[PDB]
Amino acid sequence: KLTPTGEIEHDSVTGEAIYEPGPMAGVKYPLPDDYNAENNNSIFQGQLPSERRKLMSPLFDASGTTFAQFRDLVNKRLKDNIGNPRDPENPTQVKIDE
Amino acid sequence: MKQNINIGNVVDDGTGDYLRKGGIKINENFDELYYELGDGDVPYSAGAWKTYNASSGQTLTAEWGKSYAINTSSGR
Amino acid sequence: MKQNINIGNVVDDGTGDYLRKGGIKINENFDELYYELGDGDVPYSAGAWKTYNASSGQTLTAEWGKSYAINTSSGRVTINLPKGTVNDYNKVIRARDVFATWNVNPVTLVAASGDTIKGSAVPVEINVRFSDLELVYCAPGRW
Amino acid sequence: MKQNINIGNVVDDGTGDYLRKGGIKINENFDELYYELGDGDVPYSAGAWKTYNASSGQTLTAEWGKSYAINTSSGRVTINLPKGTVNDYNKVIRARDVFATWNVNPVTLVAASGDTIKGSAVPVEINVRFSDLELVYCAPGRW
Amino acid sequence: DSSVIYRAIVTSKFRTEKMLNFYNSIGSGPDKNTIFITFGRSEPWSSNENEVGFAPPYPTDSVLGVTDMWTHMMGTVKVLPSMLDAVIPRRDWGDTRYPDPYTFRINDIVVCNSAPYNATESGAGWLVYRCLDVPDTGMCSIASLTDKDECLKLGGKWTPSARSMTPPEGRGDAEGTIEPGDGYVWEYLFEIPPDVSINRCTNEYIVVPWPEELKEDPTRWGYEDNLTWQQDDFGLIYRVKANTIRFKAYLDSVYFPEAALPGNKGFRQISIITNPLEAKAHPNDPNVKAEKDYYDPEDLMRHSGEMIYMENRPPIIMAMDQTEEINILFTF
Amino acid sequence: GYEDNLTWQQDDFGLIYRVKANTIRFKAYLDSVYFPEAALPGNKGFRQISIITNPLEAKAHPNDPNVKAEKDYYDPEDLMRHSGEMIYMENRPPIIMAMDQTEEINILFTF
């Protein structure tokens, strides 16, 4: 939706704004044919592969990343099954004693 | 005026950054300058061109200075 | 200094943007334009801002400009910093804020090696500029 | 110049922000940090500092200024650098940087086109007053 | 159900720390709680009180249940840290008045050396031993199995079918083995000086020292000698897995201003409150936290501090003899 | 935001009681930067995630005085194996713990 993290919430659930998928999937693009300033080995491996294997990285080309903090991955979250009224519905994990 | 953060570095993929923390720094850097000369500036080097344009009142008010005219037509 | 880099793709979704690499750029800007005034802090923009406080030591030193002692009553001063003589500083004296018998001396906050060891100063001169102090450190009433 | 927008903030995992629009704000922290200060910077902070070598023709201009050597024995030189209807320049010259007969000369690094072939600048003048500007090219010692 | 599942249990050592947290929480300055014992309730309830059974009014934790309490409070006593003590279940070796005198589970702390039927060393000391192993015979624990070791894997609690002759005799770990004779491998852990045992230890529980009194000498506690890979391992309150604490005070210490009432009519309900403020004449005064030693409950502000425990009991009239004792043993 | 409450001066400030909080959780940030070893392409971080209390430093050579351990993200070595007492236990079979992905552990007690 709009500019400023477009269409803040729906106001129905309040909180943070919705996210549309946008450009979906494909190659990771070749990178600027080097991508490695010194061609260094960075943390057990060279810079050209890995050294940034993360599927989620800020491009400056979108407002998805905001600032500071971190982005939380909500697809995988270990969910307390039994708890307060709120609860995460269908739970991800369960504690079963001996 | 030289007290500002370095704001992290690109070594390989690596780790230590602050990885978007640095705004609170990045701000101070800007926040150094735009407030270091902040209520004022240098008028002379940028206060030259404009008045080569018309004689109009050309407000320089309440900071720096503006219109040197550097050319003919009425001097403003 | 007219050399500065604007960091990468500026707009919207895209596959274009800078590799997180940018900050390296944005790293440099603050460097360069810090090397603008390496130590330097002029008063002149703020020149009369500071000293209004009582009996201010008002250290502008090593580089900075400071002071008025605007409303005076100040019995004011200014300060020095030690040697190293890279020829940078500024100082606002009694500046454009109307001076009075509060006066000051460059010796009257802390001398370090500076001020040339000369002492006191005269009453309200304010109009126009009273003093520039000196770059580096060692200096009398500044020429 | 007090014009720059602060790019918002962080907030942990995050809510609202740039959304990659930060530099498109942040780059503007550079403009009024350049095109207000863009070309002529302040030499006389770092503009006595570069002549510590000899009579060499080190040419500081096209922005600010450099060479007072801080020292005698420099046989100091100078250039005003080119022409062309700019209006932007200055320097510290000797000032607190003390040169005995080292002088400096607007010739000495080959002023060339403008300047009216007027010789140099003072020998040891060092303390107090200074060789200041060449507006565009042109100075006959415009101090 | 298909999801990640994690199986987690808090360790028993958590409790003993929590116990060690309640201790040290008693002190004069702020952030150190101060506990009081309260009695009160002079007026009898109903007429069936003084009979058998019949139960008291069951106490409630609401605001109404607190308000009346402060109206009936006869007297209070301040608990000093000295009169609080750690305690553990005591199994006297070879005593016939408690189950399994001659047999012992895999790890069970057992005091010996007190009373004649166990002798071991002299010079008293009330020695204590953990028992690291047992003879292997006799069917034990889950299902059937047969042999000890296999019964020790797959959990299990093995009970020796052979009486253990003689008490543990030594000063150092694993005193068994090293001889064709039977017995099993008790492990010395500390000692109880005779002076403390006549006071601080009842016959249900034996004291184990706070990791303080072990300083300002260890020797009194027979801990003066130990393996100690660490410089100290000083507090052994963790070694025993001491799960509980015990309070003791003489009713002559509690303060009754009236002094003829508690004797004539008993205190029917006891409650312990925390952090009372001193008497304030009007709400013109700053809040102060209660100190000194006695506090006639008139000097306590109403609802001044929070109360962790209420008891309601039949009259428990008290004689003025200089010995009768409070107990109130906490299980933390 | 107090001083609206006259019942405050009744029982000092504080109020964790009036809410009847009766539960405590603490959390911890596990950043693969602090443990660059371990965090390599393939680390599987299999179960075991404990808690503990009051550990101690390596001590250098064993004879010495001993210090309470105040510095964050101690490596397993330097801890005097089995220093302090283990206050909690858990087993979560994989987890992941890849580099650059921080880890946030929430554990909730009623004590």
Resolution of the determined structure in angstroms stands at 3.8
Q: How far is CA E286 from CA E289, F12, F13, in A?
A: 10, 10, 12
- How many Cβ pairs within 8 Å bridge chains E and F? 56
- Rg of chain F on CA atoms, in Å: 20
CA distance E214 to E86: 13
- C23 neighbors B22 (Cβ within 8 angstroms): yes
Q: Which amino acid is at E225?
A: D
Q: Contact at 8 Å (CB) between F92 and E4?
A: yes
D23 membership: H or E segment, kind and range: helix D22-26
Task: For residue B54, count CB atoms less than 10 angstroms from its CB and return exposed for 0-12, middle for 13-18, buried for 19 or more.
Answer: exposed
Which residues pair with residue F105 across a beta bridge?
F28
| CA–CA–CA angle E135, E138, E141 (5° rounding) | 100
What's at C2, amino acid-wise? K
| Cβ neighbours of C63 in B, within 8 Å | 1
Domains parsed from chain E with CATH numbers: 10-85+244-332 (2.60.340.10), 86-243 (2.170.290.10)
Experimental method: cryo-EM
Pick left, alpha or beta for residue D12 (phi over 0 → left; psi -120 to 50 → alpha; otherwise beta): left
And the tokens for D89?
Answer: 């320049």
Nearest CA-CA distance, residue D140 and chain C, Å: 23
Report whether E135 contacts E182 (CB < 8 A). Answer: yes
What's the distance, CA F67 to chain centroid? 19
Q: How many residues are present in chain E?
A: 332
Q: Which of E5, A2, E96 is nearest to D21 (CA)?
A: A2
N-term to C-term CA, chain A: 50
C105 in Cβ contact with C115 (< 8 Å): yes
Q: Determine whether the interchain pair F100/B15 forms a contact, defined as Cβ–Cβ distance below 8 Å.
A: yes
Task: Report the Cα–Cα distance between both ends of chain C, in Å, rounded.
Answer: 30
End-to-end CA distance of chain D: 29
Beta bridge partner(s), residue E273: E36, E307
Residues in F closer than 8 angstroms to E13, CB to CB, are: 85-87
Using the Cα atoms of residue E77, residue E82, residue E86 and residue E87 in order, give the sign of their dihedral: negative
* Sign of the dihedral defined by the CA atoms of residues A16, A18, A21, A23, in that order: negative
Question: CA C57, CA C115: separation in Å to the nearest integer?
Answer: 14
Question: By a Cβ cutoff of 8 Å, what residues of chain E touch chain F?
Answer: 4, 6-11, 13-14, 17-18, 229-232, 238, 275, 277, 283, 287, 289, 303-306
Interface of B to A at Cβ within 8 Å reads: 10-15, 18-24
Q: Taking the C-alpha atoms of E46, E48, E53 and E59 in order, what is their torsion angle to the nearest 10 degrees?
A: 0
Please give the torsion angle defined by the CA atoms of residues E253, E254, E256 and E257, in that order, rounded to the nearest 10 degrees: 70
Which residues, in sequence order, are bridge partners of residue E206?
A: E88
Across C17-109, the runs of DSSP E, i.e. the strands, are none
Q: How far apart are CA C138 and CA E230, in angstroms?
A: 62
Residue F31's contacts (CB-CB under 8 Å, 6 or more residues apart) are B15, F102, F103
Both tokens assigned to E213: 């009194």
β-partners of residue E88 are E206
Exposed e or buried b per residue across B12-27, where buried means at least 16 C-beta atoms within 10 angstroms of its C-beta: bbbbebbbbbbbebbb
Cβ distance of A44 and F41 shorter than 8 Å: yes
- Residues in chain D whose Cβ is within 8 Å of chain B: 1-4, 6-10, 22, 26, 29, 32-33, 35-40, 42, 87-88
The three-point CA angle F85-F88-F89 to 5° equals 115
Number of other CB atoms surrounding residue D118 within 10 Å: 13
Chain B nearest C-alpha distance from C115 (Å): 23
* Look-up of token digits 């050309």: B58
The Cα–Cα gap between E57 and A39 comes to 82
Secondary element (H or E) of residue E270: strand E269-274
Whether there are 3 or more C-beta pairs closer than 8 Å between F and C is no
Write out chain B residues lying below 8 Å of C24, CB-based: 9-10
Residue A22, chain C, CB below 8 Å: the answer is: yes
Q: Are E43 and E56 in contact (CB under 8 A)?
A: no
In whole angstroms, give the CA distance from residue A73 to residue F101: 10
d(CA C105, CA C123): 11
To which H or E segment does residue E111 belong? strand E110-111
* Cα gap D67→D87, rounded to integer Å: 20
